[PDB]
Amino acid sequence: CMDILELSERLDLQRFHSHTLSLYRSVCALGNNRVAHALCSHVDQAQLLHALEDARLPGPLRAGYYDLLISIHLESACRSRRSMLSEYIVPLTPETRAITLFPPGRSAEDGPRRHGLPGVGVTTSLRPPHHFSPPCFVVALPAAGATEAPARLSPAIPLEALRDKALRMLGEAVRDGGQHARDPVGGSVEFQFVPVLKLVSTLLVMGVFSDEDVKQILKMIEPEVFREELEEGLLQMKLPESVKLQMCHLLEYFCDQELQHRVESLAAFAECYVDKMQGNQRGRYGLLMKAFTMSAAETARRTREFRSPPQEQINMLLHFKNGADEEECPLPEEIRQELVNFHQDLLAHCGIQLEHKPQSLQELVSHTVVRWAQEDFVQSPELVRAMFSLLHRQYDGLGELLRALPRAYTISVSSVEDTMSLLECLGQIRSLLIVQMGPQEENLMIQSIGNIMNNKVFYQHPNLMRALGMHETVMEVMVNVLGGGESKEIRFPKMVTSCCRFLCYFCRISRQNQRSMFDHLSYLLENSGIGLGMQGSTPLDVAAASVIDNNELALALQEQDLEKVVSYLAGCGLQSCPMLLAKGYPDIGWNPCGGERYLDFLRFAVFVNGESVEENANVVVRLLIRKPECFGPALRGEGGSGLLAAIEEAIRISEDPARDGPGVPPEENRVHLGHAIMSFYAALIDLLGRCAPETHLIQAGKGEALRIRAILRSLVPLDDLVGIISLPLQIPTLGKDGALVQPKMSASFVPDHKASMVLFLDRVYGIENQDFLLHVLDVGFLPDMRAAASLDTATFSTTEMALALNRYLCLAVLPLITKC
Amino acid sequence: GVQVETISPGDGRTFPKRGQTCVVHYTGMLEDGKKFDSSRDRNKPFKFTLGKQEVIRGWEEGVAQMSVGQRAKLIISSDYAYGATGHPGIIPPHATLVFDVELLKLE
Amino acid sequence: ACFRMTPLYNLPTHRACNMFLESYKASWILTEDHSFEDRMIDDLSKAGEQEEEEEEVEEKKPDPLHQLVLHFSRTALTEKSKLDEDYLYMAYADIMAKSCHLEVEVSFEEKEMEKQRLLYQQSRLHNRGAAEMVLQMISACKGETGAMVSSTLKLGISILNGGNAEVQQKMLDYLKDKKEVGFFQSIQALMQTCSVLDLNAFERQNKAEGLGMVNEDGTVINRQNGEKVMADDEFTQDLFRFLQLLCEGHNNDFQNYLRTQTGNTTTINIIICTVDYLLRLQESISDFYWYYSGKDVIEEQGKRNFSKAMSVAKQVFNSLTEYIQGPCTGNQQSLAHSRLWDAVVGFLHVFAHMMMKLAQDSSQIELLKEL
Amino acid sequence: QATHLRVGWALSEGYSPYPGGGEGWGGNGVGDDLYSYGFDGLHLWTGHV
Amino acid sequence: RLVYYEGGPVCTHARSLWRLEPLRISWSGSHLRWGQPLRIRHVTTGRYLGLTEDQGLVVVDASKAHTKATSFCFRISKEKLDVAPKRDVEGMGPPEIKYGESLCFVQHVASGLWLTYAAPDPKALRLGVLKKKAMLHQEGHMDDALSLTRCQQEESQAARMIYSTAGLYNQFIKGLDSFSGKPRGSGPPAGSALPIEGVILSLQDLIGYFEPPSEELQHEEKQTKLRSLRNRQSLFQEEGMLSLVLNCIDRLNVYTTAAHFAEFAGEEAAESWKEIVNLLYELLASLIRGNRTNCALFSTNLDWLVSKLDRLEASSGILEVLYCVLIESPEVLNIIQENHIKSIISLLDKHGRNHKVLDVLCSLCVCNGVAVRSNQDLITENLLPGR
Secondary structure, three states: OHHHHHHHHHHHHHHHHHHHHHHHHHHHHOOOOOHHHHHOOOOOOHHHHHHHOOOOOOHHHHHHHHHHHHHHHHHHHHHHHHHHHEEEEEEEOOHHHOOOOOOOOOOOOOOOOOOOOOOOOOOOOOOOOOOEOOOOEEEOOOOOOOOOOOOOOEEOHHHHHHHHHHHHHHHHHHHHHHHHHOHHHHHHHHHHHHHHHHHHHHHHOOOOOOHHHHHHHHHOOOOOOOOOOOOOOOOOOOOOHHHHHHHHHHHHHHHHHHHHHHHHHHHHHHHHHHHHHHHHHHHHHHHHHOOOOOHHHHHHHHHHHOOOOOHHHHHHHOOOOOOOOOOOOOOHHHHHHOOOOEEEEEHHOOOOOOOOOOHHHHHHHHHHHHHHHHHHEEEEEEEHHHHHHHHHHHHOOHHHHHHHHEEEEEEOHHHHHHHHHHHHHHHHHHOOOOOOHHHHHHHHHHHHHHHHHHHHHHHHOOHHHHHHHHHHHHHHHHHHHHHHOOOOOOOOHHHHHHHHHHHHHHHHOHHHHHHHHHHOHHHHHOOOOOOOOOOOHHHHHHHOOOOOEEEEEEEEOOOHHHHHHHEEEEHHHHOOHHHHHHOOOOOOOOOOOHHHHHHHHHHHHHHHHHHHHHHHHHHHHHHHHHHHHHHHHOOOOOOOOOOOHHHHHHHHHHHHOOOOOOOOOOOOOOOOOOHHHHHHHHHHHHHHHHHOOOOOHHHOOOOHHHHHHHHHHHOOOOOHHHHHOOOOOOEEEEEEOOOEEOOHHOOOOHHHHHHHHHHHHHHHHHHOOHHHHHHEEEHHHHHHHHHHHHHHOOOOOOHHHHHHHHHHHHHHHHHHHHHH | XEEEEEOOOOOOOOOOOOOOOOEHHHHHHEOOOOEEHHHHHHOEEEEEEOOOEEOOHHHHHHHHHHHOOOOEEEOOOOOOOOOOOOOOOOOOOOOOOEEEEEEEEEE | OOOOOOOOHHHHHHHHHHHHHHHHHHHHHHHHHHHHHHHHHHHHHOOOOOOHHOOOOOOOOOHHHHHHHHHHHHHHOOOOOOOOHHHHHHHHHHHHHHOOOOOOOOOOHHHHHHHHHHHHHHHHHOOOOHHHHHHHHHHHHHHOOOOOOOOHHHHHHHHOOOOOHHHHHHHHHHHHHOOOOHHHHHHHHHHHHOOOOOOOHHHHHHHHHHHHOOOOOOOOOOOOOOOOOOOOOOHHHHHHHHEEEEEEEOOOHHHHHOOOOOOHHHHHHHHEEEEEEHHHHHHHHHHHEEEEHHHOOOOHHHHHHHHHHHHHHHHHHHHHHHHHHOOOOHHHHHHOOOOHHHHHHHHHHHHHHHHHHHHOOHHHHHHHOOO | OOOOEEEEOOOOOOOOOOOOOOOOOOOOOOOOOOOEEEEEEOOOOOOOO | OOOOOOOOOOOOOOOOOHEEOOOOOOOOOOOOOOOOEEEEEEOOOOEEEEOOOOOEEEEEEEHHHOHHOOOEEEOOOOOOOOOOOOOOOOOOOOOOOOOOOOOEEOOOOOOOOEEEOOOOOOOOOOOOOOEEEEEOOOOOHHHHHHOOOOOHHHHHHHHHHHHHHHHHHHHHHHHHHOOOOOOOOOOOHHHHHHHHHHHHHHHHHHHOOOOOOOOOHHHHHHHHHHHHHHHHHHHHHHHHHHHHHHHHHHHHHHOOOHHHHHHHHHHHHOOOOHHHHHHHHHHHHHHHHOOHHHHHHHHHHHHHOOOOOOOOHHHHHHHHHHHHHHHHHHHHHHHHOOHHHHHHHHHHHHHHHHHHHHHHHHHHHHHEEOOOOOHHHHHHHHOOOOO
């Protein structure tokens, strides 16, 4: 062994050891808290704390040890806190109510030229706490299975002592820089300042510094600007560009704190003002109701406001910026004046309302950035970008608040705990965006999604979820895993299934959520070129849920997206499924299973709220005929056998093993080819029947409607529909001795296949002649109705076939009979 | 396993009992003598409750035999230590552990 | 209605607070007018203590505005697959564009003073490399529409307004020195992405507007979805305005360059690209006229779409006029041999029929004037 | 680190423990080389064993 | 040997580059004229477009490229005006055909057949064949006209370099295969002579050709040079020079040392074995450095590279190749395995404390801001506990 300080002269060992520290940082990088705990055994807390203060350490080793401390103990917490620092969830508590734009002062309680010290005071925006675990290598190891144990927390290090040491070290560095010695700590001014400034910035962002510590930091930055109501601060020390970059990071933190203070003051004023507005409206309603209502017109005009939606009521009650009478806006003059005063205060705070020393954070940052740019041709592009971003923020303060407000959100006290839990889960999900998916990450993602979906705040504050961008994060994770080896069978199908369950309920929670997810339909359709074998929800399911039963979004649908789906369907109708071929299924030449999924999406695109969307229906029909392979081999013009023959052949296939499956089963032998063919054709007929025009359009005689109906009739003969409807179903029976011989619903012709034929018959051909009605009743409907009636015995009542027949009769057959 | 070899005597009377919280200071080394853990490095005594299976079996039994104020060397075999799995990145598989444990107090 | 009677005073406090924040941001903060662009540009253009720097060497260190422009030029010149959306660049491009204002009968002296003021404001930027930065950013966009290229085109228009000959010379010299095909490839791609009147989109928008509300305005979307018909008309006008301003003042060199780039390995005829877009727009306008021919009166939505299409067509006609005026004989010949005559024939048909249709209802007098 | 205290004999020519680093993990005293022989109460030290 | 119409990214590759060679030496660089007979040469393969009685339109070798088979002309239209003759001119001549603008029909002079696309064969669309075979037909189609597009000097030079280098390295591989398994005892090498000098000079020239731009350059110039370097790397990779370099490396790696090589190739040839191996590894590193597409190729044959880390003749070069691949390709990071990590650690164990191995291990952990937990855990478990 030797003294580590010998590496100042032993340069090869110095380089190797600095790269070893880099390797430690790399192996614990980006949230590997387990490896951080392991590294705590190799570079212990005493060693790290000693290295922090070692003034003789070579510069590379000093920087490496500072970075190692940050990586092991602070990097994960700092990243998690930074991810949340851009949102302002303000709970409506007394602490929030007490927040004011300007500090109460003798010169003026609100409005004075003197801001409060940035980053000092009361902040109420919700930020989840930091979680650490003690480093200890004598504890009993958890026998719990891997990929199931809770994720390791970052190793703990005494934060109070660390922050005190950091402040002392920064002060010492400032003093030494003032003295201008010839032996700077670490070998240079950069190696002396950059590590300490990095540590201080990390702790500041983590939010561990107290108010006194923040005041000390501000006084170190600028003694005069941040004096409380040596004489040279950091900002004027002739510092290198890396040190300037660190100073820019500190100034960025303090500007962010000022913006947060503005947002919170706005939230508190909003609470008080909204209370007053609501009270005034209640009083005015009382007066209006208690009035004699001499003029019915006057009463109706007054009640227009109170019958308007609340958002419009607020807009009307606030529309008095440029003046208004007591009729266009009944808000009293006192309340108007209160809003005007607050607006003036906000403009003054932002500097909008309108010396050799700055006297404010905005002026200080502006002057410092401009002076740096004037003094040197800055060579670091990162430094240039940072200082010009700071300058833009200083010059446009109102714009910064305007762009930050969309991410502000006020909640009641009762929601704070659930919001904190949701924020913790969202933090975990966000942290999983910088790591390659594995079993542990998949388990964590699934658990976090489940917790979010079981959290009440998720359902009650969809606007908050959208502002937090939860859907975008989940979609990003899903698309990461899907793109990973796109051609190769995608891994983590369980996590993709959860990727719906979350996003794919999220569309349903609210209409705005549905629109937000619809905005990503092309991306979902881009990544939906696979699936099926998932046996669970898919990005195609997300696409369907983003448009289901929304007339506005269905009309907003794009012909390009419809074309992409139709092209997928054509591919499915032309090629067999490679996954099935690998599993050993017979090669039938096409992919009914995927075709059915694409047809289902098209059905949801063309049918909305029980009515056909004419634009989408016509576009879909045109695309389908332009790519005839989408109709399946049966409806092929030249060699097609017809729908009836195709269904009969599918029934034969289902009855014959070694043609229906591999014949060498997580769910019913996975897939059965006969049932898949029947389901594909049923879905196609359903889609075409739903594309069929509406009766009112037909009566009006629109040429497009008549042409589309003629095309559909040419595609599907009536006799084929009647034959399929007349095909017999296999009903449950009793055999042997009390053995319930039931059909396999997943491998046989089922009433759901007849339901699509009935829908097509009703919507395209319709029943208008008594002879045809009686013929179809005699051949197809009555046998099924009699079978359903006969299956009403206690033994067969709840059988799968009995329930399917009941659904078929009550959803397709009987309503048609009532209509006819 | 666990062998206990006294380094400095204790009071000889007060021995830990099940449910009592032992507050100790320890330094852990591998059989070949490589240090891997120490509470003195963190400058904070380690506290653990007897009978709660919080620490390894070797620690449980050795500290049970130890007395208040005593310093002792615990030699713990693999079966009484992290065994075949070990502690990935810290303790190799099938490693005998040596600890220099001082029983500061019981609470 | 009366049965519903949804009052604001019954809403939970936090919901009312969120609604108030939205409304206040929309009506009081967003409406606030605060001009800082000129002050910012002046402050950044001012150099400081050059005497202390003792920069007697000919190469003066760039001032802060020059350094900002150089940073954005470096970002544009970086080799990448795509140009990432840069909010900082967009904001500073907007600031620079607004710094060149381009502001009864005004005297000849007043007009000259305004022109000189605009020239000085534009020189503040183009003496710092803003023209080359604009060209580099257009090339880097690689033909992809978006906020970045929109801001770049607006900045280029701001520095070229009035037919700035010095800016035109700098841009032409840079293009001919670099001999890069990417700039005109990007221009052609953007021109091809420019949209025209879409009758299917019009019908879909009509149906969407027809759909009514049944719940609170906040709960419903209010069918305020961005326009689906010629949604990028502003970008199209900006693109063709930039191309026009490149030739404004009868710049023969740049007029010829827009037709043929002799030094480049491949050339793109921007004149014919403009003619192709004009033909597409003319066909869309003819389709719109045929859609409305049967109807007695054009509704307000159709009138607004017609007006947008006519404004775009006006800009395109001005661009072609600037291409050929001076005259540029080569551009005249290329247009004469292009499909411009077919577009003019279609436009004449549309003009002739729409004049008579609109003259029959005084409610469309503004549309008739625009036509 | 546990306080070091050892007593014994050492050979004049050869026993030269310099401050700081050395054999093993440093802190070399009596019995940390083959020129000295020390006792610490529990162990006999020689050759750093 | 077959010609196609293809419109994918091939429009920027070297296999679509052709050279027009008039049937004369003097003033061959004169302006091309309608009806002027000429040959069409494929630059990267050196083969000539021609008509064969048994296969039709193909590219033939220069040895079989006689005028009747390989003579073509450009015609403004398909009308039968060729009756009009033409006389050679001692000068640049009249400019007739223009790049981009002129539309030209290619006609085989001897037969008069027109260059056209073969009738779309069935199931090609299903197979995904976006390329249409080209043929010579009596009538052709109306859209047979071709546009001549100029290529950059960089692309032309790269194509010629690819042709020459492919020839040289294929000759080298053939020479090695000649004595692959034939010990010479004490006699002659028993094979074909190796182009050692040519191979060494070519490798050095290509390393200089692919040298990255100097960091002491202006940003604009550096970006242009990086763009050119990436384009040239892609051209060589697409023409398959990377595979050729790998094959040469394999043939030379069959031997463990210079003496072992001498046992089959002779002492004179073995005097350059180490130099050639090191130059080949250097060229591979230059060819893949900074190129994600080229680096991702190793995701399939990573073991090929990792298994060679312990070779003592080119240890640093092999490590540099691995460093480039890991730095550029996340795909390789996602297929890294415990045996690979153990081999890299064994490099530290057996070669000493080299910080470049630590850099390789660092690059195994995080790429482009995304961490690989499996790699991190494997490194931690196999490197730290031993101490």
